[PDB]
Design a protein around this ligand. Sequence first.
Ligand SMILES: [Cl-]
Ligand SMILES: [Li+]
Lengths: 60, 60
Amino acid sequence: MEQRITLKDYAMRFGQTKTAKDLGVYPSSINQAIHAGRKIFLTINADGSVYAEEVKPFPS
Amino acid sequence: MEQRITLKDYAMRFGQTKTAKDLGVYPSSINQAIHAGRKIFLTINADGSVYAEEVKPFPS
Ligand SMILES: [Cl-]
Ligand SMILES: [Li+]
């Protein structure tokens, strides 16, 4: 069973550096995304690999 | 949210004209987005307001 949690919740546990490493982004990107309230969801596989997706408005 | 359905399902249920009007876009935008297979979902709120979102990987 994979877990699925918000970006903010992952960072609240793991901190921004690890979150950034696990998603392949810069730490600033994690900070900005949380501050902006972007709708980003992290699927955490049982081995603790992470895949993220974002839910964006349509139209832009 | 009271209901949430795919863009294609919304169009089948309600038709292109209403779909486009509900999102404030031109009909061609609906038709093309469905033809492109974009991962778009429409939310119908209890007050009757409708909005759409697209799911994309993060990061791009
Ligand atoms: Cl940074
Ligand atoms: Li969460």
